[PDB]
Design a protein around this ligand. Structure first.
Ligand SMILES: OC[C@H]1O[C@@H](O[C@@H]2[C@@H](O)[C@H](O)O[C@H](CO)[C@H]2O)[C@H](O)[C@@H](O)[C@@H]1O
Ligand SMILES: [Cl-]
Length: 248
């Protein structure tokens, strides 16, 4: 049907995911970096499939002891694992043993931890390569999960092609991508959507970020500094932004 998803933050109570779901089927998924249902203005997900995410090894709001319980209650078809462990002081071996213990048991589609686009040893795809070696085939997974932030569509295209060249038998989900602050976000996503839509090895992609600029600044001011406000899919009024209009 389509590959587009909403990267839906915890602070999004005021907003309606259904605004970006016009029935044509391009937008199919939503995740909220947690294992509880997306906070929304309707209480529901606007007809999108929620993907559970165990983004840290354990937290108050997503206790890992409740991960199997939540998947069973909510009936997710897919689950995401750790968010950027490659820059959060989690070794590939630690992630492999944690994944085997906690994520393996969910008999659904599963993604390995979202890694950053760093080229440094022990980060990014180097980290992911070490985690797959530490797994030694004992991790069950369907997808590798990528983040990308950078300065041009050309650089993004080169990064996705690099990932595929290095992992050619693997399926990719992109859980966060945008330009860093300054660039034309509309031009970037106008280029990125048709590029990713044509790649049979990319199953899902989620622009950072399905919120409004006012909510981004009020709750994630660090992200405004890094990325700016141009990649927000919503206007402050809670309709589609210029980038949101590209989701339909
Ligand atoms: O993610 C890979 C595949 O995992 C499957 O669940 C696994 C069971 O089939 C397997 O025998 O048990 C393991 C370890 O408990 C489960 O992860 C999913 O059912 C598949 O959908 C998925 O493609
Ligand atoms: Cl990145």
């Amino acid at each position: 049907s389509g590959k587009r998803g909403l990267a839906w933050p915890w602070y999004n109570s005021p907003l309606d995911p259904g605004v970006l779901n016009n029935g044509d089927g391009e937008v199919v998924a939503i995740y909220d970096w947690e294992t509880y249902a997306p906070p929304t203005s309707t209480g529901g997900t606007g007809g999108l499939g929620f993907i559970g995410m165990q983004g840290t090894m354990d937290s108050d709001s997503s206790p890992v002891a409740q991960l199997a319980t939540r998947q069973a209650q909510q009936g997710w078809a897919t689950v995401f694992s750790l968010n950027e462990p490659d820059i959060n002081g989690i070794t590939p071996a630690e992630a492999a043993s944690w994944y085997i213990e906690w994520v393996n048991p969910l008999a659904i589609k599963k993604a390995l931890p979202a890694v950053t686009s760093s080229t440094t040893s022990g980060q990014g795809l180097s980290w992911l390569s070490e985690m797959i070696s530490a797994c030694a085939g004992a991790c069950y997974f369907d997808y590798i999960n990528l983040h990308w932030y950078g300065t041009s569509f050309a650089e993004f295209q080169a990064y996705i092609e690099q990932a595929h060249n290095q992992f050619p038998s693997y399926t990719i989900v992109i859980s966060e991508f945008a330009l860093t602050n300054g660039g034309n976000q509309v031009a970037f996503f106008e280029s990125a959507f048709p590029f990713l839509d044509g790649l049979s090895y990319v199953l899902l992609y989620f622009p950072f970020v399905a919120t409004s600029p006012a909510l981004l600044q009020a709750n994630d001011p660090g992200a405004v500094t890094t990325v700016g406000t141009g990649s927000c899919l919503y206007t402050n009024a809670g309709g589609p932004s210029s980038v949101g209009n590209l989701m339909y």
